[PDB]
Design a protein around this ligand. Structure first.
Ligand SMILES: O=C1O[C@H]([C@@H](O)CO)C(O)=C1O
Ligand SMILES: O=C1O[C@H]([C@@H](O)CO)C(O)=C1O
Lengths: 296, 296, 296, 296
């Protein structure tokens, strides 16, 4: 029998004056409790209980021992309470960073379902992108990030689980002069709103231009806000690249077009990124499952 | 004495985090980047970098030195760009942050106007809010921030110029239970998505509930991403506050509504914020001009 | 519920810092130490250990849990030792700390007396001072501390029993410039070696200079090691305060002197300090008895 | 010419109205300064100075540029001041741990000499031993430790430089019954005051007994305080092992003897131990040199 339940029982035996009565009160087996106390007495080499007409009393050794017993039972309760609070604070909070596409499609449906399965968790959500999220993942102020990355180029401190394979489209003002282009080379003369990517401003379009044999793309401006990007392109002649989800869910849809090229653009893999030494909360894993569920 | 040429070296080394990865400073001929840092370390008489687990890391001295290094480098660049501008050679950089209400309405029109008049100025557009923008204002890495703020509580070294008086609304899913509420008191029991604000996450609804005599609003989640907010609200029963301009310009407009409230809500003033003792380049001035104009 | 058997396992694992190095728990047959920790982790519902750079490290939960684990294990051991003692079987452990004035005079005589009467009790003797000893008093890892303290400023859960009223002297190199000073004011310009004390390093000379109307004493060095103090003073012109007993009993007595001062200095009371709610084992009681006796 | 001295000169030129006068004031070469300003003007593509009858004035471009120049000169001064303070605090403090032998012989003479060569450094000295010092060396609260260790068994985070090779002697009460022993086996019947060592209480004597084919040494008591050890052995029949320096410099010399065995005891190597990522202060290295100097 678990020692703490034995000590707990002795505490009860002191108050109600019977082994039998104590076992029934704490829902323990009489023959098991009796054998536990006996075992303990043999280890102690003294009796804790002396019989009377009514029941039992603590012996002299029993009274000495009970002071220790009382402190051990109390310490156990306090320990479980301290850690219950600390763990309660831990499990009750999630802080993460999401890419624009996850935030526009996956997250909203994920968050609804999640909050039913995990009703007691505050979630804190922010915009984020790798490599910028790396330092706060590392220093712990950020639990995980849901962001694009390149497998062969990720921090070693970080674990990376693929979430889904994403799409990138070239976007322009609805009647862009190059709306009918089928090739990258046909856009050499356009100016670009360099959108953000793991390898730097406009890295996706620069690298596309490079592999297809073209010079550097002509810069129009650098637009790091994905919130601002769709309207900016709508009121200018600048082209940009963006996630398909952003193109499909933005405020300026009817003023924009995509320019679908027969030349291939990349498919940025979206990753769960977190520090690997770190333990993941049940809720954190839960939220990931739900976002995953809506990223199929 | 310091060698201003080495400051960008240090800046670069802290960013890429590697000894060798820094060689893209066009030191693809020699590791005399080390000699350059040796000098800087002796001028300050303190170790700046440190042999580390994944490559190279700044010491506490290095970290302290960065804000000064960055202000020096960016002020030098601004000095040079200004002189050319004063000669009608309109080249150079502008980096600025914008709140969602500026970013979705005035900004697209202003950027296009500016680019037409100043075709060769490289502009960098970011999300940003006060007070988070303050340290990038302070080290010269942002020229200005277009953000909500409270006049009576802006840091002393910051210049604040009123740009726009914005409008707060209360937003929920289209067939929300409270869709037809007209009083703040009717929303007492609702769960909220705390959106970002100068005085902290959810400060607007928190401070409103307070003034209207209510208890703390009930937290559903913290959502710092304005890109994510409309959709989160669309696919749940969470209420939120948001700029009217965002309410009117998002991808989930069909699935949302604004609560027809007859209790009044705040009208946050959007400001142009700058570190006051920094002379504004003629080009940056030119852009603020345009944002003001389109801000109506 | 907790399994008290696993607590020593956890204790051991945190000390040796290794997964496998812990197998000296006589688990040289199986890694079912892991199963034991799995249970504990589930009882607390929190990760306790963490896969780490050099082996295994406690999580913040593990760290929080240690004081409770240690008090439980040591109270259980004390419960068992007491019972045997109450039966005239004088076996078990005593761990205690002592200040230099107790350690150099009363302690040698007391330990010898005690060992003659209680030949089989294992005694553990440590340096220690208040308040540094407090957390080891609190977690049961020290049975008592014999230390200077101030009555009006001892933590509430600590029992404090006057043992000895000690004597402070001011000590310097034998032919010190001030060797013949009779007034504290004459030592105003001297450099001091700050020795340890309850109110902080050099608190005695600091608080003396203050009461006698002087400015802050001049710091030469901080010397927490009483073993080192006499020699440091012997081979320099640094003055220090120290217990008269230490002044009288060190290896550099020939090369030292005490300043023949007619301004009075404090007489720190040495106390027997214990966490008050912990029942003192008969053996430990037996030793405190002897230390008291020899303390004269 | 260093750019900061150029900007500094332009600041001077604005105030005193002459290039010639400014070069002489700041002790710079006229032909060099003139060429520097010229070079700067060519890069700026505008003149900073216009001639008058007296001297020069800033041009319009000069006045624009000077605002930036003034800020860059000021920032440089502030940077050097911030880091000068931080580094000043760093270089002006040493905190270390010493073994009993170092503290009794090396340190006192080291500290005197050191403090002349490095007069502005607070030194904080404490008792310490490996492995106990390891966590605070690692977390930085302790600069270095001068302690015994075993080369083939030291933490990887730590660098270890040998300081000197030490001696261990068996010590007893002046007329110990075993004072004439020449072999370890002759002491099998004695009881020991287990003194502290890297591999645990009494590890030196246990391991000596083991290699010479003997059973475990009989325990008398565990004495972790090296301050207490000599008097404890003097007023009992317990034997101990200790550093030769402790045996030669303690308060109870005339009441003790050594028991020099023809059996060999170990020669514990004393190490400088520090975290290797950490930069060492000039003063810290200096103190080590002086302790080294007195450990020959
Ligand atoms: O910068 C780049 O953009 C794509 C990337 O999006 C693929 O995921 C790619 O291969 C690059 O080199
Ligand atoms: O514990 C031991 O004591 C000596 C050591 O002092 C040598 O430096 C040794 O070899 C052991 O195994």
């Amino acid at each position: 029998m678990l020692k703490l339940q034995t000590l707990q029982a002795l505490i009860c035996i002191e108050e109600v004056g019977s082994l039998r009565a104590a076992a029934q009160l704490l829902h323990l087996s009489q023959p098991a409790l009796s054998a536990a106390i006996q075992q303990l007495e043999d280890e102690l080499k003294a009796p804790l209980l002396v019989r009377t007409k009514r029941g039992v009393s603590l012996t002299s050794f029993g009274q000495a021992f009970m002071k220790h017993a009382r402190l051990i039972v109390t310490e156990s309760r306090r320990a479980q309470e301290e850690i219950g609070q600390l763990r309660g604070r831990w499990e009750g909070h999630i802080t993460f960073a999401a890419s624009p596409a996850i935030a526009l499609a996956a997250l909203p449906l994920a968050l609804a379902s999640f909050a039913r399965e995990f009703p007691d968790v505050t979630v804190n959500v922010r915009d984020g992108m790798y490599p910028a999220v790396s330092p706060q993942l590392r220093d712990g102020t950020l639990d995980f990030a849901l962001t694009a990355a390149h497998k062969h180029d990720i921090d070693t401190d970080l674990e990376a689980q693929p979430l889904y394979v994403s799409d990138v489209v070239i976007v322009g003002q609805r009647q862009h002069p190059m709306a009918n282009a089928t090739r990258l080379a046909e856009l050499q003369e356009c100016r670009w709103a360099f959108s953000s990517a793991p390898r730097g401003p406009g890295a996706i379009i620069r690298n596309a231009f490079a592999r297809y044999g073209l010079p550097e793309p002509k810069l129009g401006l650098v637009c790091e806000s994905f919130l601002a990007l769709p309207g900016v392109v709508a009121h200018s002649d600048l082209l940009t690249t963006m996630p398909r989800t952003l193109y499909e869910r933005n405020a300026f849809k009817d003023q924009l077009c995509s320019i679908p090229l027969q030349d291939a653009l990349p498919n940025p893999t979206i990753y769960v990124l977190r520090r690997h030494d770190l333990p993941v909360t049940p809720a954190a894993a839960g939220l990931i499952r739900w976002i995953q569920h809506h990223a199929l």
